[PDB]
Design a binder for this molecule. Sequence first.
Ligand SMILES: OC[C@H]1O[C@H](O[C@H]2[C@H](O)[C@@H](O)[C@@H](O[C@H]3[C@H](O)[C@@H](O)[C@@H](O[C@H]4[C@H](O)[C@@H](O)[C@@H](O[C@H]5[C@H](O)[C@@H](O)[C@@H](O[C@H]6[C@H](O)[C@@H](O)[C@@H](O)O[C@@H]6CO)O[C@@H]5CO)O[C@@H]4CO)O[C@@H]3CO)O[C@@H]2CO)[C@H](O)[C@@H](O)[C@@H]1O
Ligand SMILES: OC[C@H]1O[C@H](O[C@H]2[C@H](O)[C@@H](O)[C@@H](O[C@H]3[C@H](O)[C@@H](O)[C@@H](O[C@H]4[C@H](O)[C@@H](O)[C@@H](O)O[C@@H]4CO)O[C@@H]3CO)O[C@@H]2CO)[C@H](O)[C@@H](O)[C@@H]1O
Ligand SMILES: [Ca+2]
Ligand SMILES: [Cl-]
Length: 496
Amino acid sequence: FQYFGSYYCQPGRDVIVHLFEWKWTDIERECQWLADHNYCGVQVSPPNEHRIVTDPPYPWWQRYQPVSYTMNSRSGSETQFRNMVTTCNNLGVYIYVDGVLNHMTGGGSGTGSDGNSFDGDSLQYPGVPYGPNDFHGSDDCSTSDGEIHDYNNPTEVRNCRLSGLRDLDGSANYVRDVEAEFANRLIGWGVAGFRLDACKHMWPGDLEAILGRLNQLNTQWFPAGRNAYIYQQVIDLGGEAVKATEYTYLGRVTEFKHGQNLGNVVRKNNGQRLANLVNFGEGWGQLSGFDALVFIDNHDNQRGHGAGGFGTILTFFEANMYKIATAFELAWDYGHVRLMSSYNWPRNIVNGVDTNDWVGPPTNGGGDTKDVECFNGEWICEHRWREMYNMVRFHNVAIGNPVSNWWDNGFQAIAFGRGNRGFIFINNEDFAITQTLQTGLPGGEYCDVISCDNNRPPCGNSGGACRATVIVNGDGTATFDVPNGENPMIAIHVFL
Ligand SMILES: OC[C@H]1O[C@H](O[C@H]2[C@H](O)[C@@H](O)[C@@H](O[C@H]3[C@H](O)[C@@H](O)[C@@H](O[C@H]4[C@H](O)[C@@H](O)[C@@H](O[C@H]5[C@H](O)[C@@H](O)[C@@H](O[C@H]6[C@H](O)[C@@H](O)[C@@H](O)O[C@@H]6CO)O[C@@H]5CO)O[C@@H]4CO)O[C@@H]3CO)O[C@@H]2CO)[C@H](O)[C@@H](O)[C@@H]1O
Ligand SMILES: OC[C@H]1O[C@H](O[C@H]2[C@H](O)[C@@H](O)[C@@H](O[C@H]3[C@H](O)[C@@H](O)[C@@H](O[C@H]4[C@H](O)[C@@H](O)[C@@H](O)O[C@@H]4CO)O[C@@H]3CO)O[C@@H]2CO)[C@H](O)[C@@H](O)[C@@H]1O
Ligand SMILES: [Ca+2]
Ligand SMILES: [Cl-]
């Protein structure tokens, strides 16, 4: 039985970006920028035919209610999808499909994004086709409303309806065949892998049966005999009967503890200290790095969906702390890193819940999506922020080097290197620090890539606040002058 947790990237590329609700034409155009900045790939929103919800008007979450496995979605047509995949693959930037296999729609009836009808009440999905026999039901789920309530009951979690979403019978050969045909069609077009939605709600044995039906990647671009890359969404913050460790034998698993812990640390919640990150990773009770897909925030928890709440996870709304957490995550050596890329919406937290957590992407009406224009107040484009992409370059130069030359002052300042390739100093204190440290880097003149454009003089001041150059002495020490406040961190590194 094959393992699907290994990704495939061009040399010098590694980090993934979730281009949440981006249209295919925009992702196709973005792949040139992503390749130039040595990102490895893109997670795309569910591309199959999905529900069109008009009350409320065209929420993002309509794409998590499949109507069929045809390929006309809010992000564009099948033609536009295949154009995107071909162009991106040709640039060495790969595509990971948000694959929604646990369920179809909730209740009610309507027309999906490709003109096929559905009826959640009668369990009729003629575009597939699925009927009542293809779903779990009262024989499989004994809760009074048929929905999931008790996360200490694995059978309930896996056989009942997640928030009323009609729950497919993943044990049936027909459903396994239909879902593998969908995945294999995507793979045949050049898709490199999948973010598998709601895997906590599916039996690992059913996922194993589906994955065992997959074809290997398309050799127009990928090496012969290469399994697709599979990472599985399982929210495991402890204290439940379904565990992430149940899924790691199939592929990687989303490590939600990672963003919870880094959010709490950088926020200094309940007396947390940055110095505690000295052993961050598996030693914090998390998955092994090889098993983990890691990220500061995702499309659910930036808007309170999933575990819930707004006092821990860091997002673009907390931009300064968010950059600190992401910089640490990119400079560290733990997990496959995914960066969220968001759109703005009128987040309105009332009694701990965002009342507008349903709002979809920038739109002119009718359920369309507007062309991306980064930094216009509608598209956030975190992956295009200099502090992000320069730390992606830092991360790339550092690939294969362990953490070295760790230093901490005991509280909210840390520093560490990656072999002889890069060094970062993070000052999360409310004061300024002047500290000479062994960097492990060759002597020379370096630029702070958090504030400057380049890694060596001329440093480049496109952001307007490029700091004075950092001198690494012949002995490898450098004196770091890091004021507290905005971007309170200095990162330096060598060239490839
Ligand atoms: O139709 C009848 C039906 O109406 C109501 O339900 C509807 C609901 O109000 C409406 O918002 C929508 O549901 C959305 C959902 O709100 C969105 O979040 C989105 O859900 C997908 C999500 O984006 C995915 O990333 C993925 O995340 C899931 C996890 O896989 C789950 O495990 C679960 O996390 C739980 C976690 O595991 C636990 O440890 C604990 O922390 O609690 C968490 C749950 O709070 O939830 C997350 C986040 O949703 O999977 C989701 C599904 O793909 O998209 C949904 C579909 O559009 O549609 C509902 C159906 O109409 C009403 O509430 C029902 O009672 C009623 O039967
Ligand atoms: O070439 C395009 C642009 O490049 C340069 O802009 C950079 C910035 O120098 C970076 O600092 C960063 O900008 C982020 C910023 O770090 C982040 O804090 C956030 O700022 C928001 C803020 O959250 C919000 O409160 C409010 O004040 O609006 C700010 C943004 O206007 O988001 C910024 C990105 O929008 O990344 C950009 C792009 O790399 C250069 O300075 C620009 O002149 C240039 O157009
Ligand atoms: Ca299920
Ligand atoms: Cl996810």
